[PDB]
Amino acid sequence: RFRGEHALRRYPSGEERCIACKLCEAVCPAQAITIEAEPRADGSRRTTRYDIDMTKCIY
Amino acid sequence: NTTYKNLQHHDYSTYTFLDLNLDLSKFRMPQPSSGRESPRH
Amino acid sequence: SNLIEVFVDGQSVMVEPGTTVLQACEKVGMQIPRFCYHERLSVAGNCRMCLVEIEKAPKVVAACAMPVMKGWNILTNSEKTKKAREGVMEFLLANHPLDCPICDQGGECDLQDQSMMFGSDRSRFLEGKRAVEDKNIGPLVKTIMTRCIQCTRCIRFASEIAGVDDLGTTGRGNDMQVGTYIEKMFMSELSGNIIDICPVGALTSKPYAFTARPWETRKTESIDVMDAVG
Amino acid sequence: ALFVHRDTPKNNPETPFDFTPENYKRIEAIVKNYPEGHKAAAVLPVLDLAQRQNGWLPISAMNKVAEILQVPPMRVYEVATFYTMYNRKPVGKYHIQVCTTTPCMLRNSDSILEAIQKKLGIKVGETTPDKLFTLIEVECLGACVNAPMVQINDNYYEDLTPKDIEEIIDELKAGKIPKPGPRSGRFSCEPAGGLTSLTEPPKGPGFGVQAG
Amino acid sequence: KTSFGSLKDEDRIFTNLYGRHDWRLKGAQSRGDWYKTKEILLKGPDWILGEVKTSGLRGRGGAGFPTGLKWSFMNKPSDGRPKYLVVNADEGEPGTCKDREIIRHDPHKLVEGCLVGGRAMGARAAYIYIRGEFYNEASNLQVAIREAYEAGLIGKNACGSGYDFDVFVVRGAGAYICGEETALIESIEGKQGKPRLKPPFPADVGVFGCPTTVANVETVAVSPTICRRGGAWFASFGRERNSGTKLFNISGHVNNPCTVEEEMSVPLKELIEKHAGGVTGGWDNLLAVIPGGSSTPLIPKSVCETVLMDFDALIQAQTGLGTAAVIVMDRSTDIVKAIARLIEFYKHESCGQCTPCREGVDWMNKVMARFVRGDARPAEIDSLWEISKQIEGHTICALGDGAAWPVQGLIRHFRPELEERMQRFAQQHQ
Amino acid sequence: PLMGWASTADPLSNLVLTFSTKEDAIAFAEKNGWSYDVEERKVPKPKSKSYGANFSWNKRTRVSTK
Ligand SMILES: Cc1cc2nc3c(=O)[nH]c(=O)nc-3n(C[C@H](O)[C@H](O)[C@H](O)COP(=O)(O)O)c2cc1C
Ligand code: SF4
Ligand code: SF4
Ligand code: SF4
Ligand code: SF4
Ligand code: FES
Ligand code: FES
Numbered sequence A: 001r002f003r004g005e006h007a008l009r010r011y012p013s014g015e016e017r018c019i020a021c022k023l024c025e026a027v028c029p030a031q032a033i034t035i036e037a038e039p040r041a042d043g044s045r046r047t048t049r050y051d052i053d054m055t056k057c058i059y
Numbered sequence B: 001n002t003t004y005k006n007l008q009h010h011d012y013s014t015y016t017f018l019d020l021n022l023d024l025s026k027f028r029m030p031q032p033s034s035g036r037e038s039p040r041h
Numbered sequence C: 001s002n003l004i005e006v007f008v009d010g011q012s013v014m015v016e017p018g019t020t021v022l023q024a025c026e027k028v029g030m031q032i033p034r035f036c037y038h039e040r041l042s043v044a045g046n047c048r049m050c051l052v053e054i055e056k057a058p059k060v061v062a063a064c065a066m067p068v069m070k071g072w073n074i075l076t077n078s079e080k081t082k083k084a085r086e087g088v089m090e091f092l093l094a095n096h097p098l099d100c101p102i103c104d105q106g107g108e109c110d111l112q113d114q115s116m117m118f119g120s121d122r123s124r125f126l127e128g129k130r131a132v133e134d135k136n137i138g139p140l141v142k143t144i145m146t147r148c149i150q151c152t153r154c155i156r157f158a159s160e161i162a163g164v165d166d167l168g169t170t171g172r173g174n175d176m177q178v179g180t181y182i183e184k185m186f187m188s189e190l191s192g193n194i195i196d197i198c199p200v201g202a203l204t205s206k207p208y209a210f211t212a213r214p215w216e217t218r219k220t221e222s223i224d225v226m227d228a229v230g
Numbered sequence D: 001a002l003f004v005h006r007d008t009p010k011n012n013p014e015t016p017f018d019f020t021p022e023n024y025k026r027i028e029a030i031v032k033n034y035p036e037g038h039k040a041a042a043v044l045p046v047l048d049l050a051q052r053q054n055g056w057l058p059i060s061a062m063n064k065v066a067e068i069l070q071v072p073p074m075r076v077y078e079v080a081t082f083y084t085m086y087n088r089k090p091v092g093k094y095h096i097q098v099c100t101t102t103p104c105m106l107r108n109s110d111s112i113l114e115a116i117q118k119k120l121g122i123k124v125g126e127t128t129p130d131k132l133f134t135l136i137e138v139e140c141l142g143a144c145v146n147a148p149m150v151q152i153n154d155n156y157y158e159d160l161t162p163k164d165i166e167e168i169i170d171e172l173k174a175g176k177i178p179k180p181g182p183r184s185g186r187f188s189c190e191p192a193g194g195l196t197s198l199t200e201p202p203k204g205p206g207f208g209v210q211a212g
Numbered sequence E: 001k002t003s004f005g006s007l008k009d010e011d012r013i014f015t016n017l018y019g020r021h022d023w024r025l026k027g028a029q030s031r032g033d034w035y036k037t038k039e040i041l042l043k044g045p046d047w048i049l050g051e052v053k054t055s056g057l058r059g060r061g062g063a064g065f066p067t068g069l070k071w072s073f074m075n076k077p078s079d080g081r082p083k084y085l086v087v088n089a090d091e092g093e094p095g096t097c098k099d100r101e102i103i104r105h106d107p108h109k110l111v112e113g114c115l116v117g118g119r120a121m122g123a124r125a126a127y128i129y130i131r132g133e134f135y136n137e138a139s140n141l142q143v144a145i146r147e148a149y150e151a152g153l154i155g156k157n158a159c160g161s162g163y164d165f166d167v168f169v170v171r172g173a174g175a176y177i178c179g180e181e182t183a184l185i186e187s188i189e190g191k192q193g194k195p196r197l198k199p200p201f202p203a204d205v206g207v208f209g210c211p212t213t214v215a216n217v218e219t220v221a222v223s224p225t226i227c228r229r230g231g232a233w234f235a236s237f238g239r240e241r242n243s244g245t246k247l248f249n250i251s252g253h254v255n256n257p258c259t260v261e262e263e264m265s266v267p268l269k270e271l272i273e274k275h276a277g278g279v280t281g282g283w284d285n286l287l288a289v290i291p292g293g294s295s296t297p298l299i300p301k302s303v304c305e306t307v308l309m310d311f312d313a314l315i316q317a318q319t320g321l322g323t324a325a326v327i328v329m330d331r332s333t334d335i336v337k338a339i340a341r342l343i344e345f346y347k348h349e350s351c352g353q354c355t356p357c358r359e360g361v362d363w364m365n366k367v368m369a370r371f372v373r374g375d376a377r378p379a380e381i382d383s384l385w386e387i388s389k390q391i392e393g394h395t396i397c398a399l400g401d402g403a404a405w406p407v408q409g410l411i412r413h414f415r416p417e418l419e420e421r422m423q424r425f426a427q428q429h430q
Numbered sequence F: 001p002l003m004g005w006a007s008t009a010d011p012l013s014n015l016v017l018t019f020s021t022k023e024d025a026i027a028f029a030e031k032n033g034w035s036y037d038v039e040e041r042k043v044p045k046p047k048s049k050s051y052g053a054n055f056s057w058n059k060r061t062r063v064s065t066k
Helices: A023-027 B016-023 C021-027 C079-092 C111-117 C154-162 D021-033 D039-053 D059-068 D073-082 D110-120 D162-174 E025-031 E045-055 E067-073 E100-105 E107-120 E135-150 E183-188 E217-228 E268-273 E311-316 E335-348 E355-372 E378-391 E399-413 E415-429 F022-031
Strands: A033-036 A049-052 C004-008 C011-015 C051-054 C060-062 C072-075 C141-143 C168-172 C175-179 C203-205 D095-099 D134-138 D149-152 D155-157 E084-089 E125-130 E166-171 E212-216 E245-250 E258-263 E286-290 E327-330
Touching (some): B016 D021, C011 C021, C079 E355, D021 D039, D095 D110, E025 E107, E025 E135, E045 E067, E045 E107, E084 E183, E084 E217, E100 E107, E107 E125, E107 E135, E135 E166, E183 E212, E217 E245, E245 E268, E355 E378, E355 E415, E378 E399, E399 E415
Parallel strands (some): C004 C072, E084 E125, E125 E166
Antiparallel strands (some): A033 A049, C004 C011, C051 C060, C051 C072, C141 C203, C168 C175, E245 E258
């Protein structure tokens, strides 16, 4: 359960796993997460920008 | 008695209710109006 | 001088005749939780969340549409008031899908706030959860009718203010769709106001749809243009 | 069960639908039953008249009822989708409804269902590969003192058994509609044995009247 | 005090229940209808209200409010709006068969009762809401109303009085809650059939807004004989509070199932055996007996060895007596399957205003399906008890309470059979 | 210009001072020095709604859909 170098997962044989639901931006105690969301042409809600500062991140 | 006194309703067709409703048109109270002819006048 | 005494939680207050129980509880400052009462529309008794106990009475009455008799004494924090609220809340979250991440009213829902501050903690209802095919009300209003709680507040709003008469309940039992039967684009004035009326994330905004989240955007007072009313 | 219209070009207005002027005279009488100023209350009998003038009702019929009774159409769509007479999908000439809830089921209803099923072939909900035998099961029709019961169009059948099912279906195939009374004795709701209820003739006028 | 008795003929309220006698206005006049009715119309509504409150006519239809107090609620001082009488002739509550028989065989007694009820409160018109599934009997009622108007009997100068009065027949469209007290009133108005809230009672806001009242066909049909026969003679049948004659409809697993008229107070074993054959396989073969119909919890055998058929006695047995549907179920029948099909009935016929009955009937139907298959553990049957507590008493109408009662009666009385079913499925699946 | 954030030259912008009356608000704003615009508190109007008038006879408050 070691914590460090976080990265985004994706579905088994599929697309990105994130939703841009902004739960992680709401809970981030350093306020390091920056999310900007747009839906693509398919209609599923997605992102544009998901930026993390590793400098601010207390892990 | 042992003889069933219906079978008056044996030969009721489809439109008999509305035909009797048409036959009972006259001798009826004059349906009191209330301001407008409809809730949207 | 047209005064009636109501003891809200024991505390006395004078109230004009004809008003509801909920207006008296808001006259003392209480909020009885509610889903289908709205202070600009006609009162219907559909949602049943608004229940409150009157002392020396067997039944639990609906505070949205109850007039005031002489000398009440109203318990807003009694036993069966809380039991009725937790019960109605446990019914409402059954046929309501798991969409709180992808939903658009995720910060500003009412099921979430009232299921925090009034409802139960553990759930039940192992099997079930109906799903309803969504409609297309308009190209300005995104419509996911799976999240609908059938509170019938879009219909009362359309019929009594927009004057259009296009939205209708259809069906019985669990199968009560709320929408247009004839695939017709509900296109009229004040069609945008229906997204603030619908308290759950069913009738949501189309251009706003998946672009924000309401705990981040800060609020600012401002005045309209392009209309003489402002 | 398809509570969205989904144009389906046998529907999809305008489908040609019109009333006989004798039916206009009917609708005049039905609207004159109700008090003036509340003309919107005749939607249910006028829409029933449309159902019996055209065996299943299209969307042009609902629009025409809304035009005659000057109501918005959406209220007519609510009333047509709410009730159970107004079969919006097209049905056949005859329309079998097997009524089963508790006492119908508690007196061996499933044998009647399988007898209909193997005399006709097609299952519930759908229809035969022609018209006139749309089969559905239904909830209580109100004759619970008899068998699981058979409703054909505006006609009951009570106190049945699968051989009488075969008789009724073959005579409907012949076209000669049978008598709508119950079968196998007790022509109405009677104790079928000795008839231990009232036997003496009634007393007529003035039997113990007081301050009339 | 006659010790709870049994009925004897010449005191039945209405004969010709089987169609054996001539049905016409001539036949009704031979049987004894429309006799001295002008002196009933010309005596005053104080007399009719005093007679009905004196006789103690307990109201029928499943509610059980006393009829005299309701008709006295209809004595508002007269405003510029008229008053209506709505005769409710629906049969839901599967087991009923109650006033289908009256409305087919003797409609002239219904016209008796509606004229006396219209005079009783200054009413102006009587809307008779018949079930949509009763088309032949609706045509028979139209023939009766036609002959009533054609003999100059009612209409303008009703029975020679100076009191106009008319009767209209509204066919329904097929529902069960249109049989209620107020969704009936919205079904007349041309809306969809859904109930209203209670703080406007029908004595203040009713059919389009006029103060109306709703009455069952048994109460209406007994209402002329209360006036034309003796004062409080109707309360010489049974106990004192709940008194008179009632139809009893014995369907199900009895030999020759039928309908009878009897006293209100009557023992259940004598009711079942001595008028409708016997229980198939002797008296010991029966498993349970539900009185009332679908809005009443069940009665096991050891309770129904003694308990008579009265409102207060069945409330002391913790079962609210509905209307006359005294049906049985056999030892060799899955009572769980029968009650689960009854819950499927409530799912098919219920509107969806209230979130409690809608969501609760959803859960109770899925849970009763799983208990027919036996696919749970006893914490689920306790949770079924919890939801059947939470539905009852939080709705508009009494269909939610009626969906909560038989589930409660099943959990009260047939607990170990559910335990055995779930044990069988566990031993087979494991 | 490296990530697309919202940089600002504003220390005082992220403040909020929740008070309980207008008088103490004006007193604090005049005490601590800066300018102030005091807006108005606009209560909801006490209406009178009635289900019985939602089901009236001759009036135009006939909902026709419930
Ligand atoms: C679910 C339900 C079913 C009802 N079924 C009937 C019915 O079959 N017949 C009837 O006249 N009233 C029926 N009612 C209405 C009430 O019984 C109503 O009180 C009755 O018409 C008059 O009551 P009373 O005889 O006590 O005056 C029903 C009510 C509900 C809630
Ligand atoms: S926004 Fe954050 S919390 Fe939400 S799905 Fe994406 S990574 Fe997970
Ligand atoms: S409407 Fe409310 S409860 Fe439903 S998914 Fe959206 S946030 Fe969740
Ligand atoms: S769409 Fe929204 S406003 Fe309309 S009934 Fe459903 S939850 Fe209520
Ligand atoms: S309890 Fe159910 S059937 Fe009764 S009014 Fe409410 S939604 Fe309709
Ligand atoms: S607010 Fe009273 S029922 Fe919804
Ligand atoms: S259940 Fe079949 S007739 Fe009542």
